[PDB]
Structure formats: C-alpha cells, structure tokens
Amino acid sequence: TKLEEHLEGIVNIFHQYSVRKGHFDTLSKGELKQLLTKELANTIKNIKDKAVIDEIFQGLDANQDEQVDFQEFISLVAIALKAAHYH
Amino acid sequence: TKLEEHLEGIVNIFHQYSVRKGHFDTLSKGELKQLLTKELANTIKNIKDKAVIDEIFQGLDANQDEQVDFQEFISLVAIALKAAHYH
Amino acid sequence: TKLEEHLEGIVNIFHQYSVRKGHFDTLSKGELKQLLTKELANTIKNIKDKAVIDEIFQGLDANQDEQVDFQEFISLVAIALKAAHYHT
Amino acid sequence: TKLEEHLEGIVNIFHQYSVRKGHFDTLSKGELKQLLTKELANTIKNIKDKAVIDEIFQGLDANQDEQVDFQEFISLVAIALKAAHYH
Amino acid sequence: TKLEEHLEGIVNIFHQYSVRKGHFDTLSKGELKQLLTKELANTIKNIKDKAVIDEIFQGLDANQDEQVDFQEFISLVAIALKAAHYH
Amino acid sequence: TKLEEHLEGIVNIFHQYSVRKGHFDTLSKGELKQLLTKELANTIKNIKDKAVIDEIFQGLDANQDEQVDFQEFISLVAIALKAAHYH
Ligand SMILES: [Ca+2]
Ligand SMILES: [Ca+2]
Ligand SMILES: [Ca+2]
Ligand SMILES: [Ca+2]
Ligand SMILES: [Ca+2]
Ligand SMILES: [Ca+2]
Ligand SMILES: [Ca+2]
Ligand SMILES: [Ca+2]
Ligand SMILES: [Ca+2]
Ligand SMILES: [Ca+2]
Ligand SMILES: [Ca+2]
Ligand SMILES: [Ca+2]
Ligand SMILES: [Ca+2]
Ligand SMILES: [Ca+2]
Ligand SMILES: [Ca+2]
Ligand SMILES: [Ca+2]
Ligand SMILES: [Ca+2]
Ligand SMILES: [Ca+2]
C-alpha cells in the first residue's frame, strides 16, 4: 500500500539520520538538528533557529537520556503531520 | 523534502477516503473501514475482521460524533508507525 | 474574573451531581448519566442513548473503580469544549 | 443549560482575546499574556512573572507556530480546572 | 536503592508472567489474566470479572497485535498506582 | 502480593520525601531534588546535574504550583520504569 509505503518511508528517514553517530537506533541532538533542518524546513516555522531546535529536542527526549528514540520520534511525526495538514 | 513528501502523502490519503461520503473533511465508519482494509492490510493484525475495525473506530472517535476527523486520525498514524518500525 | 467564574461554575456543576449518591466527590454511573443528559444535551450527539452514556462512562473511568472523579472528569470537559467551539 | 453556558463562556473568553491582533482565530504571545494575567490572576501561581507566562506559552504552543489555537488552548483549561477544584 | 529495587521488582514480575507461553517477552491475554488476578486482586475493583480483564487487555494492547509488550504494560502500572496511593 | 507490595513501596518512598517540608503530601523542588538523587541515581542519566533536576521538576509540575503531587509523580514513575527495563 501507498500508506504503508509512506510509513516505511518515515521509518527509513529516521534511520537514515540515526546511524551517523552514537547509537544507531537513536538520534542525538546533532542528528535531530540535521533531520529537522533538512527534512521539515518547510513545515515547522523557524526550524532554522538554534532555540527552536533545542526546544523540540528537549521535548521529545522524554526520558532525559539525551537521545531521541523511535517511540519518542513519533511525537514529532504527529506535530509535523499537524502542520502539513494545515497548509 | 522527502519527509515532507511523506507527510503530504498521508494527508492526501486521508482526504482520498474522507470525501467519499458525508462531510468532506471527516471519515465515517464506512470510510474508515475502507481506508483500513486496503491501506493498512499489511500493518495491523486481523485488520480485516469486523471486530477490530469497530474497536479501532470506537477509539479514534474520541468525541463520539460518529466521525473520525484529522486530529483523531493522527492517533492512527501513531499506532501504525509503531508497527511499521517493528517489522 | 469571568474565566475564573466559569471554571468555578464547572466545578460546582460537577459536585451538583456528585453529591446525589455514594461518595460526595465522585460520580457514579448513575450520577454521570444525569449530568450528561441534563447538562450536555446539546453538545454531544445522541447523548441520550444508553450505549453512548456507557461508552463515555467506560472511557472516563481510567482507574476502573466505577467512579468518575474530578481529574477523570476533566477529560469530559475537554471533549465538551471541543464540541462547543465547533458548534460556535 | 448551565454547563453548556460555561463552556460557551470559555470559548467566548478565548475569542475575546484572540481578535485583538493578528489572526482572529488564534492567540499571540501577547494576546495570551493579556488573558493569563487578567483572567487567571487568582488561579495560577505567580502568573504575573514574565518567566511563568513564557513557560505557559511555550507549552501550549505544540506546533511551534508562535500561536495558540483553540485546540491547544484546551490544555490551558485543563491546568486551570485542576487548580480551581483544589481550593 | 529502594525505589530502583521496586522498579526492578515490577519488571521482574512482568517477566514472571510473560515467559509462560508464546513470546517470552510479551504478555498474552491468558498471561495477563494471570497477572491481574493474582498480582492485583486487592487493587483493582472486580478484577476477577471476565469483563474487566478483557477491557483492561483491550485497552493496553494499543497496537492490536494481541500481546501486551513492556511499553504497553507501563500503562497498567499507572492505573494501579493511582489506586494504590488511594488506599 | 509482590506487585502490590512494590506499588505500595513506590507510594511510601514518595511520602518519605514529601513529608519533609511544606505540605506533607507534595514534593517541593528541594524535596524532589533529594528523591531524584538518592532514589534514582543509577536510573536516569546525569540525574546529578542541577540542570536535569530542574528540567525534570518543570516537566512534572503540570499545574505550575511549584509542587509535584502524586498524580504528577506517576509520570516520573513511568519514565523511570522505562529506564529500569532498558538496563
Ligand atoms: Ca545516533
Ligand atoms: Ca533534556
Ligand atoms: Ca530519550
Ligand atoms: Ca466523509
Ligand atoms: Ca463511539
Ligand atoms: Ca470524532
Ligand atoms: Ca457520588
Ligand atoms: Ca470499566
Ligand atoms: Ca475512577
Ligand atoms: Ca490573534
Ligand atoms: Ca516554542
Ligand atoms: Ca500553535
Ligand atoms: Ca508470553
Ligand atoms: Ca483489540
Ligand atoms: Ca500490543
Ligand atoms: Ca512537602
Ligand atoms: Ca514551571
Ligand atoms: Ca503541581
């Protein structure tokens, strides 16, 4: 299915960024910064702002381990999905 | 981007199903059952069974208006995304 | 303030039904049914139907104690709020 | 009914502050501070400190669009309700 | 520490039921029925009723794969604590 | 039963810290500080850093009353469990 394909897509993009550094299944502040700035540049306003990136990071990182795992990632998909529907 | 592409895809699928009947911007049970069985067939177990479909509908429709609106639909992406990353 | 008065309003309405029976601070299915059918009759579709009332009770009672307490009630005020704004 | 009046009341108050500037349908940081400091003065601790208003704004604005829309505002009502029943 | 001790306790108890049948690391409807009725009988009302066990299983199995995984099980702890501090 | 004993355990630790200052039934920052660093040292990363204790305090304190009450505490239990299982 296309819907399935879009889902595997999102999953693929997650890993695309999570493997660069440290844990392969988790995103570091730095990797999330990349993901955010390159992949949602037209979705989240001011995503370019150091403060905006930090605020998003601190909020996904529910368990304070300094990493964003896949389950925490889902939150971001939901926010983004909200924006994309608004346009 | 790609990520933005996928998210736009998801939005577009919603609407692919929501305009068939009643309100254009929301899914009725019928509409939701179509979307589930053909677009998540390989994602949610037993998704074809009547009981599962009803259970999922009853859960999304948080405000009991017998419609699944976009906000409510986000939750399903969440459930699905979970599953898709699992495979 | 006006906003403070409406919030005090909702708390008072909650007690208005929670004292009828059993614990004074919680709603039983009965007390909830009365509240729903007499105070949200124009907010939630088919609120009069048995099925709907139970589905609602079954969802608010997160701890499964057969009582809806105030924190659990706040959920209902959220659904209700969505509803009112949409009508508006 | 009364419960319904109170709800419509809260929606009204929302609109009373959202129409002063920018989109009519949403609350700016500024609009939000106004409502907080004169509508909730006797509900949230130290709600008259810049720090506390920032924090509430930052939390209610989940999509980071620098605006607080009605669905996001509902969370504010939840926090408030909590406080009001405590008295 | 003691808190750590209790948390480890909970995980342990999860496992003592999850390994009985099927996947070792997730709970089947049967496995859960066993955990609820034996470990939570003085905590959740009417936990010995067929109907309640199922409503609790249906609720926990957020992804409809007919198993309760540790993440899903965490919500049971939340429901239970609420009750425990009540006594 | 053991699970029940662990739950009660969790409630007792909470109170062990909550009775120290101000209201016996809620944790002040200071009280929360102690609890975190003495009961979760081997569970949450850098729990020792003043920045992290503050961030955790700010997240639990949903109503902004500068106390963490039992309900709000349950979120902390969930973050911790998640970690303890991961270990
Ligand atoms: Ca990484
Ligand atoms: Ca952090
Ligand atoms: Ca994390
Ligand atoms: Ca439709
Ligand atoms: Ca329903
Ligand atoms: Ca709905
Ligand atoms: Ca009562
Ligand atoms: Ca129930
Ligand atoms: Ca209850
Ligand atoms: Ca405005
Ligand atoms: Ca922000
Ligand atoms: Ca916003
Ligand atoms: Ca098993
Ligand atoms: Ca199910
Ligand atoms: Ca499951
Ligand atoms: Ca205290
Ligand atoms: Ca704060
Ligand atoms: Ca608090």
Token couple for F76 = 């902390």
Resolution, given in Å to one decimal, reads: 2.7
**For chain B, percent helix, then strand, then coil, each to nearest 5?**
65, 5, 30
- Best mutation target among F64, F66, F70 (most D Cβ atoms within 10 Å) is F64
Nearest to A48 by CA among D29, A56, A67, D68: A56
Rounded Cα distance, F20 and F26, in Å? 10
CB contact (8 A) between residue F84 and residue E4: yes
DSSP letter for each residue of C45-87: TTTTSHHHHHHHHHHH-TT-SS-B-HHHHHHHHHHHHHHHHHH
Answer yes or no: are the C-beta atoms of D41 and D31 closer than 8 Å.
no
Alpha helices in A1-87 (DSSP H): 2-18, 29-39, 50-60, 70-86
Answer yes or no: are the C-beta atoms of D31 and D53 closer than 8 Å.
no
Token couple for F40 = 């979760």
Answer yes or no: are the C-beta atoms of D27 and D67 closer than 8 Å.
yes
CATH 3.40.50.10470 assigned to domain C1-88? The reply is: no
Nearest to A70 by CA among B43, B81, E66: B81
Backbone angles phi, psi at A38, to 5 degrees: -95, -35
Rounded alpha-carbon distances, angstroms, from residue C87 to A21, C2, C6, C47? 50, 21, 19, 16
Q: Domain B1-87: give its CATH code.
A: 1.10.238.10
| Ligand 2 center–CA A58 separation, angstroms | 5
Answer yes or no: are the C-beta atoms of A58 and A67 closer than 8 Å.
no
Residue A44: CB partners within 8 Å, gap ≥ 6? A36, A52, A56, A79, A80, A83, D63, D64, D65
Half-sphere exposure of F71 (CA within 13 A, CB side): 11
Residue A28, classed as helix, strand or coil, is coil
Annotated binding site of F: 15, 18, 21, 23, 25-26, 31, 61, 63, 65, 67, 72, 85
With an 8 Å CB cutoff and a minimum of 3 pairs, decide whether chains B and F touch: no
Residue spans per domain, chain F = 1-87
| Ligand 9 center–CA C29 separation, angstroms | 10
Nearest to B37 by CA among E78, A1, C64: A1
For tokens 């009341």, name the residue: D9
Rg of the Cα atoms in chain D: 13
Backbone angles phi, psi at F51, to 5 degrees: -60, -35
Nearest to C79 by CA among A79, B65, D13: B65
Cβ-nearest to D65 among A45, A55, A56: A45
- Best mutation target among A42, A82, A85 (most D Cβ atoms within 10 Å) is A82
Nearest to D14 by CA among D52, D44, D40, D42: D40
DSSP letter for each residue of E33-52: HHHHHHHSTTTSTTTTSHHH
Rounded Cα distance, B9 and B3, in Å? 10
Chain B contact present for E58, CB below 8 A: yes
Residue F48 CB neighbour total at 10 angstroms: 11
Half-sphere exposure of A16 (CA within 13 A, CB side): 14
